[PDB]
């Protein structure tokens, strides 16, 4: 239990309820290589919400791309999880999602954004613990970071997500 209880704590400790979420990833290097070596391809982020009793969402990232971005890009995906209050929410999930890679030298953040495809199975009321991830396979070119630049400082990167709240 102690194990599962510690997971609940960290989850709570990380969760936010205004559709804004900043994901800090430490042990960049190590987690970077693991992605390369195919040992640990992806990494889920803690869950966050659009409101106190809003939608439950999280992010999934491949520090060494997935699909059209494999080995070359950094893929970042938005994930619509099954929320304890889904039956009170309007479906399909139709909220603009902005994703960013923060520049710890605040001079040029890597930003991208998209509007949910209402037909996709990624924005339909969850039946599983999580829906299928969808986002940006070519979010940012490995070289754009890795080496040095200004996105990886003290071996750590920050991913930021902003789920627009229009209509909520």
């Amino acid at each position: 239990a102690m194990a599962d209880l510690e997971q609940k704590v960290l989850e709570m400790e990380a969760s936010t309820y205004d559709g804004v979420f900043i994901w800090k990833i430490s042990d960049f290097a190590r987690k970077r290589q693991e992605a390369v070596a195919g040992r640990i391809p992806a990494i889920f982020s803690p869950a966050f919400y659009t409101s106190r009793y809003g939608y439950k969402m999280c992010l999934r990232i491949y520090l060494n791309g997935d699909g059209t971005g494999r080995g070359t890009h950094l893929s970042l995906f938005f994930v619509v999880m099954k929320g304890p209050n889904d039956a009170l929410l309007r479906w399909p999930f139709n909220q603009k999602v902005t994703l960013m890679l923060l520049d710890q030298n605040n001079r040029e953040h890597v930003i991208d954004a998209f509007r949910p495809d209402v037909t996709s199975s990624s924005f339909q009321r969850p039946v599983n613990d999580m829906n299928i991830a969808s986002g940006c396979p070519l979010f940012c070119p490995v070289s754009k970071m890795e080496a040095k630049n200004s996105y990886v400082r003290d071996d750590a990167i920050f991913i930021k997500a902003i789920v627009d709240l229009t209509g909520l």
Binding site: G67, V97, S120, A133, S134, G135, C136
Partner: peptide, 5 residues
Amino acid sequence: AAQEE
């Protein structure tokens, strides 16, 4: 949005 493979 492009689902993950």
